[PDB]
Amino acid sequence: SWEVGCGAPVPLVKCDENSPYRTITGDCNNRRSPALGAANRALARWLPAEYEDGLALPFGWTQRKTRNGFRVPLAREVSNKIVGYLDEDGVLDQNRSLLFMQWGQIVDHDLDFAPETELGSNEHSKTQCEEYCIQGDNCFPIMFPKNDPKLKTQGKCMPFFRAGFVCPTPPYQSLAREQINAVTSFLDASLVYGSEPSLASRLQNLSSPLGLMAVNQEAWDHGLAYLPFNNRKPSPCEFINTTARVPCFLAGDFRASEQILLATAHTLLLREHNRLARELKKLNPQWDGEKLYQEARKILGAFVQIITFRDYLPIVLGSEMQKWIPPYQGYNNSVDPRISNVFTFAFRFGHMEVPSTVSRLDENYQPWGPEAELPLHTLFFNTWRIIKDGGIDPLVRGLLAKKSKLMNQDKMVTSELRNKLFQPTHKIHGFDLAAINLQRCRDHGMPGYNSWRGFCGLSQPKTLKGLQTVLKNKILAKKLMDLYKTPDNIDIWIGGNAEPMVERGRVGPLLACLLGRQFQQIRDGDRFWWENPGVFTEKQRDSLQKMSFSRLICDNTHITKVPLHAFQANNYPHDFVDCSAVDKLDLSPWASREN
Numbered sequence: 001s002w003e004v005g006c007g008a009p010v011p012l013v014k015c016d017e018n019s020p021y022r023t024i025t026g027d028c029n030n031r032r033s034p035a036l037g038a039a040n041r042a043l044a045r046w047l048p049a050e051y052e053d054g055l056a057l058p059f060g061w062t063q064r065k066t067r068n069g070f071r072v073p074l075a076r077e078v079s080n081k082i083v084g085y086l087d088e089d090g091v092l093d094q095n096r097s098l099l100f101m102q103w104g105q106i107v108d109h110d111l112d113f114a115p116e117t118e119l120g121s122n123e124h125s126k127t128q129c130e131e132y133c134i135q136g137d138n139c140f141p142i143m144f145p146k147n148d149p150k151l152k153t154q155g156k157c158m159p160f161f162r163a164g165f166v167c168p169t170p171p172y173q174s175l176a177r178e179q180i181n182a183v184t185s186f187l188d189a190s191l192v193y194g195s196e197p198s199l200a201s202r203l204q205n206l207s208s209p210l211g212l213m214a215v216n217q218e219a220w221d222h223g224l225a226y227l228p229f230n231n232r233k234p235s236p237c238e239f240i241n242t243t244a245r246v247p248c249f250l251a252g253d254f255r256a257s258e259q260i261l262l263a264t265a266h267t268l269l270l271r272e273h274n275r276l277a278r279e280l281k282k283l284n285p286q287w288d289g290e291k292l293y294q295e296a297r298k299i300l301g302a303f304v305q306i307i308t309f310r311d312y313l314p315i316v317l318g319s320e321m322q323k324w325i326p327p328y329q330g331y332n333n334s335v336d337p338r339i340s341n342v343f344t345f346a347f348r349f350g351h352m353e354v355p356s357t358v359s360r361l362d363e364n365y366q367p368w369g370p371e372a373e374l375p376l377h378t379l380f381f382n383t384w385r386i387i388k389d390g391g392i393d394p395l396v397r398g399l400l401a402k403k404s405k406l407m408n409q410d411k412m413v414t415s416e417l418r419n420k421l422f423q424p425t426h427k428i429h430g431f432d433l434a435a436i437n438l439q440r441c442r443d444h445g446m447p448g449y450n451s452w453r454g455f456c457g458l459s460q461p462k463t464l465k466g467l468q469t470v471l472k473n474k475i476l477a478k479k480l481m482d483l484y485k486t487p488d489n490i491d492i493w494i495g496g497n498a499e500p501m502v503e504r505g506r507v508g509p510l511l512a513c514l515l516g517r518q519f520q521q522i523r524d525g526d527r528f529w530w531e532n533p534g535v536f537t538e539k540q541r542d543s544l545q546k547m548s549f550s551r552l553i554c555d556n557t558h559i560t561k562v563p564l565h566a567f568q569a570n571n572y573p574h575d576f577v578d579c580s581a582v583d584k585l586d587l588s589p590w591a592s593r594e595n
């Protein structure tokens with residue numbers, strides 16, 4: 001049996017072969033099958049999907065349906081018993097800057113987004129779901145287990161809506177349900193430019209032929225650009241402080257305002273596009289408005305890639321880097337560049353790297369003002385602290401000089417995210433990202449832990465003693481067993497994250513494998529990979545190889561002191577040097593010598 005057909009919600013457009021620029025949607029990257037790695041299509045299944053009813057119901061939907069003969073435990077109950085911790089002392093990655101957490105979220109955002117199903121704005125699937133906690137259709141509420149303190153203050157559940165799926169977004173009934181990636185699978189700064197035409201243009205400055213992205217005309221940062229604000233009302237950035245009335249930003253990606261440091265990095269990207277475009281017109285004064293946009297956008301895309309594969313992945317994998325991402329050997333069109341459904345959970349290792357507070361630091365890197373450090377939760381959907389506090393600048397210094405959270409088998413996810421998450425259609429700082437992630441694993445039909453162990457050539461523990469051995473942790477294993485009753489039922493997010501953290505890396509073996517494999521394909525199956533012969537000239541590639549996040553900071557802020565290796569843990573002033581000492585990006589090689 002088999003089904004190749006289904007790809008109905010897609011406008012299938014021309015591929016201008018030889019074009020030297022990526023499309024916005026990601027179509028036409030791969031020539032044999034030009035929908036490969038395009039946005040708005042069904043994420044890839046490395047392993048057949050696993051639902052309660054074979055088709056679409058997330059294990060845990062039916063109380064009289066076991067998984068392998070055992071009920072699956074409530075997501076919130078796994079959160080409470082395994083994921084949570086009280087004492088934030090001692091949980092600071094000694095050798096990773098806070099930038100390390102933040103880049104990961106940036107890369108994640110470039111690569112995947114599975115939007116909640118939306119059949120109703122003015123429809124009571126939302127209200128009935130939130131108010132009365134009745135599971136049905138796309139309402140899959142996260143129920144509190146006996147003894148939960150949120151029972152006392154928040155109700156019977158936290159709302160949760162099932163992710164969008166292809167074919168139709170009303171129910172289906174032939175193939176297994178397949179969730180959508182709404183963004184492009186190819187690491188191509190789609191978070192900045194958008195993955196759809198409608199937005200990419202709306203993002204553009206089509207008032208002038210300079211190839212610039214649209215900037216805030218309401219607020220400014222020492223004459224440095226801010227991102228435009230967004231249309232949407234209701235606005236959750238507004239709802240955060242209804243007095244200040246500062247809305248969310250508008251970026252290539254809709255999540256850019258989830259937290260202030262994400263919105264900051266987005267700032268650390270729009271700026272550079274425009275810097276790059278201005279420098280480019282200055283040099284090639286005959287170039288189109290379009291041409292300037294595309295060639296900046298190309299260089300930016302190349303920056304995301306280089307920072308990611310040269311600086312980030314080596315330190316997020318460790319020992320396994322070489323085992324899954326051998327040095328580049330060219331473009332391979334037989335490679336599938338699609339983001340897999342499991343990767344979208346594996347990449348959520350980042351959630352254990354988020355610490356409980358964010359600092360603003362002045363130019364001696366000392367607290368900035370009387371409220372320099374804030375609880376992370378007061379910063380979900382918070383632009384106003386950017387616009388009417390300090391710059392971006394103090395936050396970027398914090399990104400450099402403060403540390404990531406270290407994942408810890410006994411202190412997984414800070415309560416800032418585990419109890420205080422703010423959703424943008426629900427009025428409280430009262431949600432649990434960990435619960436949500438577990439529920440979503442089930443929503444998405446994920447195979448369990450041991451299925452992924454087996455996929456990656458690793459042992460598949462069956463017996464509580466065997467699980468202790470894999471996780472080198474008696475007590476964690478015990479709680480996992482007590483709750484799941486068989487490692488085969490352990491949800492991939494929590495299983496993958498429970499494994500000790502490799503060597504020199506920040507993920508376990510199961511994750512290294514899932515992540516390495518996805519990034520290898522991201523790298524090998526992209527026709528516009530920066531390092532693919534043809535995409536850039538050898539000259540051009542000699543200039544791009546010197547880019548650095550440091551350099552990005554220098555050219556787009558008024559920070560004049562940065563470390564050389566920004567992802568590592570760095571302290572001021574010892575690990576910092578002046579922007580003078582820090583390599584520039586030399587665009588001589590972009591000179592259009594059509595003569």
Ligand code: HEM
Nearest residue numbers: 101104105108112113114259344347348350351354436440
């Ligand atoms: C708030 C949130 C963060 C920080 C303050 C945060 C951080 C990260 C990092 C650092 C990631 C990678 C290193 C990462 C990956 C992914 N996240 Fe996550 N994250 C915050 C909040 C959320 C929320 C909310 C979601 C949606 C949850 C849902 O299932 O309903 C979320 C998701 C993800 C995600 C899946 C994205 C997708 O493909 O749709 C990651 C890969 N994060 N986060």
Ligand SMILES: *[C@@H]1O[C@H](CO)[C@@H](O[C@@H]2O[C@H](CO)[C@@H](O[C@@H]3O[C@H](CO)[C@@H](O)[C@H](O)[C@@H]3O)[C@H](O)[C@H]2NC(C)=O)[C@H](O)[C@H]1NC(C)=O
Nearest residue numbers: 094095096097310311312314315504564565566567568569
């Ligand atoms: C903190 O983690 C850093 C990385 O953030 C650790 O050091 C990294 O380890 C690599 C080895 O793979 C080193 O890179 C090597 O350096 C030589 C030149 O001496 C160069 O030819 C290559 O680039 C080579 O890979 C390097 O020390 C470092 N890498 C980077 C990018 O910083 C470090 O061990 C940890 N720091 C502390 C204080 O423990």
Ligand SMILES: *[C@@H]1O[C@H](CO)[C@@H](O[C@@H]2O[C@H](CO)[C@@H](O[C@H]3O[C@H](CO)[C@@H](O)[C@H](O)[C@@H]3O)[C@H](O)[C@H]2NC(C)=O)[C@H](O)[C@H]1NC(C)=O
Nearest residue numbers: 239240241242243244245246370378382384385387388389
């Ligand atoms: C909602 O946003 C408000 C800003 O839009 C914020 O209030 C701001 O923060 C403090 C509160 O006093 C003020 O900072 C200083 O203001 C002047 C300095 O010129 C001093 O008189 C004060 O003592 C103070 O140090 C901001 O000026 C202030 N602005 C306003 C209009 O109050 C709120 O705190 C935000 N509220 C929430 C719940 O997030």
Ligand SMILES: *[C@@H]1O[C@H](CO)[C@@H](O[C@@H]2O[C@H](CO)[C@@H](O)[C@H](O)[C@H]2NC(C)=O)[C@H](O)[C@H]1NC(C)=O
Nearest residue numbers: 204205206207208210212213214215216217228
């Ligand atoms: C689109 O670009 C035009 C041309 O630069 C912008 O107009 C400039 O705006 C800046 C402030 O943003 C001021 O110097 C002048 O108003 C214009 N400068 C020049 C040299 O003409 C316009 O702001 C941009 N529009 C948007 C919405 O970003």
Ligand SMILES: *[C@@H]1O[C@H](CO)[C@@H](O[C@@H]2O[C@H](CO)[C@@H](O)[C@H](O)[C@H]2NC(C)=O)[C@H](O)[C@H]1NC(C)=O
Nearest residue numbers: 328329330331332333334335336520521524525
């Ligand atoms: C591109 O990648 C694919 C991986 O799927 C390679 O194709 C496989 O190559 C191995 C060894 O030659 C064979 O055993 C497989 O059966 C091949 N499968 C297919 C579909 O071709 C391919 O060799 C790689 N190409 C390059 C140039 O590296």
Ligand SMILES: [Ca+2]
Nearest residue numbers: 110184186190
């Ligand atoms: Ca992308």
